[PDB]
Design a protein around this ligand. Structure first.
Ligand code: NA
Length: 330
């Protein structure tokens, strides 16, 4: 089997991407944030505290003839941005882009933090990191990908995120029409439960490539590119008037600037992030200070290849017995 679903930016900045997901019988379609940096499929629901719901579509398990309470199971998750959610668990039928899993753990939120409530466009998350990170207790649950894997034509999914445009998540196949050149594969460590890999270096604009190992994770659920402070300083030093602002919480730059590209290495291959991808617009409405898309990972304890980086590439998440990542230009 295979599945193919379109993923759509939630706003004009590509802050996140939503993908429609069918849950239950008859189907309830929710727009979920597919997150390769976490391993829980959780939704706004009929159980979510009413004051914490503001515009989201909810899953109502009582209206699904295939929903079953997973008795005694709870979940609770905290993300890198400080947000959180928790609740109880149902199993139900979940379909993505025509690919169906029966008996998927659907984590029903009883509580969500303010950042979730405030984002009316995201109805929940669908985690695509390794199932070792799933938070369900006392019986850890599998991701949608891990439950689908054995049925797929190939044990893979691909992320093809758009820049200010829709893109695609595919499950079970490589679309050889969706990228240019060849795919370069690179080793993955699953020791922290992430799609963790080592970039071979970077370049700023038309500058020389610096060969250096940068361990980090491929995380579709993180907006920005978070890299070591040395790398990030080297990038923003090429933008007149850019500075790190403790008040704003990262590098800002004049909105009048033209940003340089950023290149990262994948083995001997190179992915180029156009400068435009690195512009996250005014820090507040009407400001001439703009927020940068490349930020320091210092204090986060890991480098994160978030959407700024991933949307410059066609990315293969290879879930074979020995997982690997692939990157192609597009
Ligand atoms: Na922000």
């Amino acid at each position: 089997s295979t599945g193919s679903a379109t993923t759509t930016p939630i706003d004009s900045l590509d802050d996140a991407y939503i993908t429609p997901v069918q849950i239950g019988t008859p189907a309830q379609t929710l727009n979920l944030d597919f997150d390769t940096g976490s391993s829980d499929l959780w939704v706004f629901s009929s159980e979510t505290t009413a004051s914490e719901v503001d515009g989201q579509t909810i899953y109502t398990p009582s209206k699904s003839t295939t929903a079953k309470l997973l008795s005694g199971a709870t979940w609770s998750i905290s993300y890198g941005d400080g947000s959180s959610s928790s609740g109880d668990v149902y199993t139900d039928t979940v379909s993505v882009g025509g690919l169906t899993v029966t008996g998927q753990a659907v984590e029903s939120a009883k509580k969500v933090s303010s950042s979730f409530t405030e984002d009316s466009t995201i109805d929940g998350l669908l985690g695509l990191a390794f199932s070792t990170l799933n938070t369900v207790s006392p019986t850890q649950q599998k991701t949608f990908f891990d439950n689908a894997k054995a049925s797929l034509d190939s044990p893979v999914f691909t992320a093809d995120l758009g820049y200010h445009a829709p893109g695609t998540y595919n499950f079970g196949f490589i679309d050889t029409t969706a990228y240019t050149g060849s795919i370069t594969y690179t080793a993955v460590s699953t020791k922290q439960g992430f799609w963790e890999w080592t970039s071979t270096g970077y370049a700023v604009g038309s500058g020389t490539f610096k060969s250096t190992s940068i361990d980090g994770i491929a995380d579709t659920g993180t907006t920005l590119l978070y890299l070591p402070a040395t790398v990030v300083s080297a990038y923003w030093a090429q933008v007149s008037g850019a500075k790190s602002s403790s008040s704003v919480g990262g590098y800002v730059f004049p909105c009048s600037a033209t940003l340089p590209s950023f290149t990262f290495g994948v083995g001997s291959a190179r992915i180029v992030i156009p400068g435009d991808y690195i512009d996250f617009g005014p820090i507040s409405t009407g400001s001439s200070s703009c927020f940068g898309g490349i930020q320091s990972s210092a204090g986060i304890g890991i480098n994160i290849f978030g959407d700024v980086a991933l949307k410059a590439a066609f990315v293969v998440f290879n879930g074979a017995t020995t997982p690997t990542l692939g990157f192609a230009s597009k």
